[PDB]
Amino acid sequence: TPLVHVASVEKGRSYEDFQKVYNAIALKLREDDEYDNYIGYGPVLVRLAWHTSGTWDKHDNTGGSYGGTYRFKKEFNDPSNAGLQNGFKFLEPIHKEFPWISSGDLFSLGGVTAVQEMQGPKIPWRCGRVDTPEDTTPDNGRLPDADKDADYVRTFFQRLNMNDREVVALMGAHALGKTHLKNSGYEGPWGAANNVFTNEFYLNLLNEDWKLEKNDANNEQWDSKSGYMMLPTDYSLIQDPKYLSIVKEYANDQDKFFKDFSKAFEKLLENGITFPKDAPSPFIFKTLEEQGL
Template identity: 70%
Template sequence: MNASKALPLFSRTISRRSFYLFSAATIAGAAAVTTAAAFDNKKQYNYNNRNNNNNSNGWGKFGTSIAAAAPIVHIAAINKDRTIDDYQRIYNKIAEKIREDDEYDGYIGYGPVLVRLGWHSSGTYNKENNSGGSYGGTYRFKLENSDPSNNGLQNAAQFLDPIYKEFNWISHGDLYTLGAVCAIQEAQGPKIKWRPGRVDLPESATPENGRLPDAVNGADYVRKFYARLRMNDREAVALTGAHCLGRTHLKNSGFDGPWGAASSSFTNEFFINLLNEQWKLQKNAAGNKQYDSPKGYMMLETDYALIQDPIYLKIVKEYANNEASFFKDFASSFQKLLENGIDYPKGAPEYIFKTLDDQDM
């Protein structure tokens, strides 16, 4: 079994936390903004000039913007020569490979780590200056893929490498997000609207480390983190429900165990378990605190925070009792997460892909 596995959306390494997210920062001056031409259609995009050694993510201790840089513009580059059929072919290749390589991670498969790659490549977004997010496909650069919070995602990127080689006209940002949509749908999850148009940006556009979340925090932290992603309370709870997939791995994240029994199926089990299991906060073998249940399931502190906050708790109960409501909210919230910071032209097509099972009917 490969040592590097899928990790939670909220994660930290064994050796250190991603403690610098929302930490106080000192900025000597506003980040410079550079304008360059997009590769395929010569439209303009802007990105932070990372040659400024004092550049930071512009977030204070409690998520307040402390930088005054001009907002970055990410214009979707829609290739009119490509149709939904072209992207459906890529979807099918990913789905078929998920089925073929089913032994990964103790037969959980690659689905969860593909979801996490799409989630994390989008989760670097900062609404204050429109930087980060999925647009530039910058996970492919060492600065981003070596972020401790991204441990294990190299397996998802390697899984997608042969797909990219076969369809090298697609951008990495489009491929990462399409892979996540495919993984969710093939796991019997909701249908998610997806739009192409991301552009491979240069390494200088890579967001700094520290924008991804830390699992050892409470509800206030969760709320402020998602606010940076333009997400409200309902969207925050829905997106955390992706923890129905996969499991944590001690060697990579410092946490250990699955969230439930159906780790390869997209369901509302995460919310059911959160409400009904007998959770006990204790230290694991890495010395990190996590909530464990007698059945061998686990919850991160950021997961458990959802039932400690009265607003979140109400939503958790709704999703536990109504899977259709969870699916509906997750689908719209996940599309929003994947598209944060992207300026789509009016009338840009939204695609809904057929699963492999749909096509067999």
């Protein structure tokens, strides 16, 4: 019988409490700048937010961000999550300092903080995820494969209640970070300015000269002479005519991409959660720059 998960505000907490958590994550992002050849922790925190939310199944309300179940071995041991231990370790001192925040609130807030501090759009964020027990952890295998085509992508994301525009917008997060051969069997960045959130993913898809190559793990990926790559699922966005139209739209309208990403990413992070009518409004956190910090 599917589970209603009702958001429950951490007792007595308000916007200022969560802004302090934001700020601690943001200051640590600035301090621990050497990680991953000076990419920093921003991208891995966005990937962590996505992987902890992307297990959701709309059919039975299992998985999703609510329960914070990545803290249990079945999930941090998911082969699809290889590498995310670095993001968890980053967040450990944050949780120690703010032990009142739930695990799902912390994982999701880490992704919002990373996007914003990397000059991305504001992402409204709601509190109130509540930790759930070990037997609520979803089985491995709910996150998407990278070696597939547009039809796979489209069908996959129906389980997360995402439409074509939402899918294409969310995939623009691949402007950030890179693939690492030891984690995923893919190697290389999608672009150049990979710790700055921009619409570069879409520009690179359209404007680079891509060649289908095998990497050192014997997997196919698309490579450019600029030193960028696209996964088969990324490249599928220009193979499918419906996705291609949307790629072109975001390549030509930075503001539109930002607005659509913000909405889709909030939705991703909120899937599965019931917000009571009297819950607080979503919070829009100030960046460190906006605060003079």
